[PDB]
Amino acid sequence: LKAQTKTEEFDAIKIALASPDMIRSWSFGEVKKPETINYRTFKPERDGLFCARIFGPVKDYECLCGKYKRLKHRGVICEKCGVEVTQTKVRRERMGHIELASPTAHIWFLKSLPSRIGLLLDMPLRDIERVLYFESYVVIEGGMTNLERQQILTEEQYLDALEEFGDEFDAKMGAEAIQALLKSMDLEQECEQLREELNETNSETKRKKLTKRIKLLEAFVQSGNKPEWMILTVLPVLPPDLRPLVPLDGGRFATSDLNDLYRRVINRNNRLKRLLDLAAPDIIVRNEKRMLQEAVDALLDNGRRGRAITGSNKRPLKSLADMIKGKFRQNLLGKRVDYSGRSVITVGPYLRLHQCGLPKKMALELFKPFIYGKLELRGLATTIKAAKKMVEREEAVVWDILDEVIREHPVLLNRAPTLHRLGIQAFEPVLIEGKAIQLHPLVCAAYNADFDGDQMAVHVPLTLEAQLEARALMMSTNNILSPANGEPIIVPSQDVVLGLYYMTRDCVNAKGEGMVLTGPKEAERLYRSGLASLHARVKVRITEYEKDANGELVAKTSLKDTTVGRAILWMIVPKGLPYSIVNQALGKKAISKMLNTCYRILGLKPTVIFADQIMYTGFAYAARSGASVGIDDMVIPEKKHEIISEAEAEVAEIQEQFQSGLVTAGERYNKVIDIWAAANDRVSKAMMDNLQTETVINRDGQEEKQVSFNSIYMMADSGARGSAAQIRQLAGMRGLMAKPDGSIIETPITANFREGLNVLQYFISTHGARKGLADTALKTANSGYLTRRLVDVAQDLVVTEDDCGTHEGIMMTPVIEGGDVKEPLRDRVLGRVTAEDVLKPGTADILVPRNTLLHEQWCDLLEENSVDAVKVRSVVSCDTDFGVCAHCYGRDLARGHIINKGEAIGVIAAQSIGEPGTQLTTGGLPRVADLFEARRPKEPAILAEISGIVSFGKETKGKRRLVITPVDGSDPYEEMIPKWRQLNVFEGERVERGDVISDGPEAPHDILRLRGVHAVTRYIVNEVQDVYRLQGVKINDKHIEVIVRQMLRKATIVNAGSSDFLEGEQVEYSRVKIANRELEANGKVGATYSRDLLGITKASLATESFISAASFQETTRVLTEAAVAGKRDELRGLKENVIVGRLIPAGTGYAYHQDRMRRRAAG
Amino acid sequence: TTDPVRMYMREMGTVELLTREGEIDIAKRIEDGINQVQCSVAEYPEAITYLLEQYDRVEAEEARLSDLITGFVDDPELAREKFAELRAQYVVTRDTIKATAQEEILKLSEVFKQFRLVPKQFDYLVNSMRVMMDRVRTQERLIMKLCVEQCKMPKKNFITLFTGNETSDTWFNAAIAMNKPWSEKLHDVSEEVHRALQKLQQIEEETGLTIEQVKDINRRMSIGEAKARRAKKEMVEANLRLVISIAKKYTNRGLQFLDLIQEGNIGLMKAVDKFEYRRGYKFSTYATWWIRQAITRSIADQARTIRIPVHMIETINKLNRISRQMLQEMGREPTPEELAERMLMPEDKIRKVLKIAKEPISMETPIGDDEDSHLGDFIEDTTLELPLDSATTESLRAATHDVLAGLTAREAKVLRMRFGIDMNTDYTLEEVGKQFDVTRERIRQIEAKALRKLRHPSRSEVLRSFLD
């Protein structure tokens, strides 16, 4: 079988140097003239940068001269002026060339940070450049004489040198010389000579530098490249259309800057071809050459020189390199999109959560071609041109059509910062009059949408795959659980929770007090008709269920003691739940957990429609309630002014003491600030005691008091809005503010918002406010950088294998942060899968048998016993190379089951972590980066480098050496510690490797090195979570672990047999290859390694795909460094596959990539 | 510091300025140089007869007088006689080779030296000379390699009987019998060296000169040639500074500084070619013309992305001037039809002129916000044909196809024929008539009824909708 020739479908991509002969391969004619277009007949001048002869016809399937204009003639190259007649398209495809007179240095390989032509010859830059500007001569193949092969001579020196040995020694200068040097260089030869030198002379200064070169050369050998190539004979020209000369209005033209450049190269090149035939003196033809060497470089990468400015325009012209770069990092906004639109969003409580409110006017335009299609499908339109006219006419017929084409056809809604995957969600469209989008209220949470005028965009899933993807993955209803922490993200929001709370809440005595009812049905009949108060204490008959059988529903009836409200509500609740869940007061918390359990017990569908019922209902009764807010709602404690004057007298006290010198000045500042900070806590807990319960009401007897029904309390107690924090600024005094300084002011704002603030008090209120806005604006820019860092280090990571079959894992315990249980065990371990079976307190008792996915029942069977710590599989431990086995991950999803093969978790990990990032304030958000960046701390601790007994030797030469002494082993470890930092180590005591040998923070690096992979991995996860969880943010460890996994992708070698000894490389490759010697060729040996902690920013920097690399790293450098080596990208990763516009190798594409990936390296 | 002005500035900063006299030192050496070859060319037999053969082409009408000579030392009539004089001295010198010929071959060249040739032709001769020396050098090297490298013979004794001859067999077959270590060796290649000796002694026939003389001439010429360039080069180098002083004037005109001085440096190279010190005109002020010529001739030429004719450029300059007298003169600025009057020409051409006179614009011109929206980002593609349209087209085909099949097979062939429909070209109605054998007015009727048919509905309904 013959492989192929023409256009098949590629995988992989190669980059390399181009031959002059190769560059000629591409051209369809040498551009010979700086002419563009004619100036009157704006036709293109042959043969100059824009040409038909060389590139293509200016108009479709039409000869230039016009002889042949008929579409029948295609492969015809017209006789007058050489023009094959084809699409004008080819003027965007066909390249051209220029032959250079004298050789020319390619600015990339000359000036890309570490000069390639430089270090390839092992020749300094300032020398090579000198040879180029004709400042000095350099020998080449210096022969048996006096002179080194790469030695440089001066005018006068070269002269004299010549008098001696005429021939048999050779010197040149300028590009031709370098080109000479490179040509002659034998890489194969230099490879053998450099190998001798390595083994002969033993030096770290000598054989360290020695090794790095010889690996680089045989790279270049094996590359495919030839060194000469870096010096240009032939220069390709970009198809015109990409540097077009198009006309504008009022008749002026506009053009790409390349033309200024290109023209200049062409010109100077020509004027030089000229100078050679005029036999001009060397001083000029030299000068010219230099100008050509420049004019090229301004063309290729302007800026590695003086930066030629564009014509008449001060601004410098865009060179090819600056054409590639695009946009700190990079950023890369790009790709506008058809079938898309947007407008302001509004509410729609009437929506089912699986849909959304889309304007007639939008939908008409969006689905337009679809309509054209359904229109002439049924025959209402004779033809498409009619359909166009029909919908243009907005004929009434169409709307009945549009509803068809609309129906089962999801659309995508996406809002501004797309942060977690829930930033895009798919809904089923419901037609709307108005130019607003109607967005279901429960989703508004995920979107971080307010309705203060936020706008969202829409997108039509065109292709069938896209519809089904939108329906089975991106649909609203599939994401009701957060992927960051499996708690419901689709929890009732604010209006709706006040509603359920006010509904399921009770007062002391009201209509209906104490009667008894058949069931909720007549509870509502009771209320609607004004007989009972919504909240009145009542015994009613209710029927709960519990499916506690083996997947089977048990029914139970009882006279539960409840309220009219909670009764009514039981009408919503599905089947297998307890009446207990609705019997409380139902705050925003309880109301969410409710939802959660519903999911975890009855499955998806039932939660979905449950959640809907809750909104509708919550809204409904929210409405009935007539809750409101007036001035009188915000009640000042009657004691306030008193409290102030008391704490106010206290300052007058600490003053008397200061004026009297009893107390010092600074002493006093912190003292006063405390008594105020204190008074404030008094006034705080004052109003709240009054506010909270002081609705006092009477039942039959005398008196009783209960939690308030005051408008404003209900808001906070429920959790609908407000926090005791904010409240405290309404009624009680508002805080102490601090000046721009950071120095918190010693006379707090004693007045509140219900009162006025005065002139000074407001003005002080200003700073914190202004810093407030400012700060959060930046902690925006910071979160954003972070999340990008993370995806950049993660991304390509996907669930690949099913079970990597490791018994290995990390040990999960509750956090116990000094006090009590800052985080529980049930939380850490839920949804994770067990390393090894867990036993009771007594044993031979397998409660959970090795790896069982620890779901909710299980966590309770665990919690039933006192189970105190569980080992769990974590991504960081997973034996799988190049991915993550489903088992070691966990289950998590917005779906509750275990993670499926192919889900692209690195991303969602990144996302999940960085999204909430906005809410952070050592400590704070930067404190996170510091961790993920693996940044070593300023003033570190140091650890026992090895176990055994220690002692001090030598003395105070800036460092008093510490000498550790092992029991069995060799003694030789002595590290020299600064004696001007306080020790903790006991000087005659034995120390475990990884003990505290001074105090202070430690670098994660030590923890890794000295204490272990699981140690550091635990260091990171807990210390970072220390930050987020202080802030009330929930992120399942799974995520932090995937990042940690990526942090230690790399390792360094220590044994021998097949690899490079000192090299840093991916453990993946080792793990595979020491396994590829352990039963393979020779033991050889080997090799032992060392896991290395990389900061994410540094890890990410190493990536196999060079295309991926040009995305985020610096593009010029990436390409050069990669191009010389003749490097092949085989895609495989995500970024790059998008870049190149093919199926993502994860998710749906995973299936495809796999099926193809095997067809490769096959038969 | 890289920037090629610097390394140029310095490299020519070395070359020292000429004395008032030093201009003549070099001026003289040039004349010597040329004159040397002018005399070296005169001495060539084929160079004479060629100018003869070439003039016989000019009176028989196969060339022109402007194409051969550039005038002499001193009219079509005058030329005819000067040529007889030349033809005359040739025919005498020709038959005289019986010695005293020397006295006359010296004169033949004299008349020949009066002739100022077209530079093109001048070189051709020079060319035909060195080409013939290459042919001599070809046969000289074939005889040496076939002897020294192949048949193992010393070049030390190879050159002993060679000098004075290298044509006859006094070296080839008579020095093989000297019974030297290299003597009996020379017989194996005897067929290859003596058979190629055809072109070598034949050159003494074409050129009419022994291999002896042939080398001497264009050798003394080569030296003269080198001699001259050497001095001219030198002359140029002296004045590079001058170019710069001039070029500093024309800077922002749309061409790089160094772009100027290199074109101006070419003006200097020119002026050095056409100059004669014998006119007492200082090389200084005579050179400033040729440079300032080439600067401008270049500028006007190539500093535009859209190149415009020279008059056009000059037409423009006048215009910026006229608005100057009249800018402040008219309180504001003169109307578009005002300068129109000042100018000599149609005066509406002002609009026409003024429009092509604009330079194109950087597509990568930043537009508002300074933001990365750039001009080119707004330039829409007009060559494209949008999909509602590509759609209707895939469709018009469909309709015309169906509408014509629902017709009569002859009315289809008749219609597909009159129009370009799924056929190359369309056919003249007569062209159509002959194709069916039943013709003329007839086919035109078949046609009209077919249209007539497709005209009302059942049929009409669909096609109509394509009309907007």
Ligand SMILES: Cc1ccc(CC2CCN(c3c(NS(=O)(=O)c4c(C)noc4C)c(=O)c3=O)CC2)cc1
């Ligand atoms: C050989 C080689 C490879 C890569 C580079 C760097 C270029 C790549 C293309 N590039 C951009 C997009 N590519 S994309 O597929 O459209 C896209 C989107 C959208 N989001 O992520 C991706 C990737 C932009 O958008 C955008 O801007 C500019 C920088 C240079 C040389």
Ligand SMILES: [Mg+2]
């Ligand atoms: Mg909101």
Ligand SMILES: [Mg+2]
């Ligand atoms: Mg807003």
Ligand SMILES: [Zn+2]
């Ligand atoms: Zn043509």
Ligand SMILES: [Zn+2]
């Ligand atoms: Zn695993």
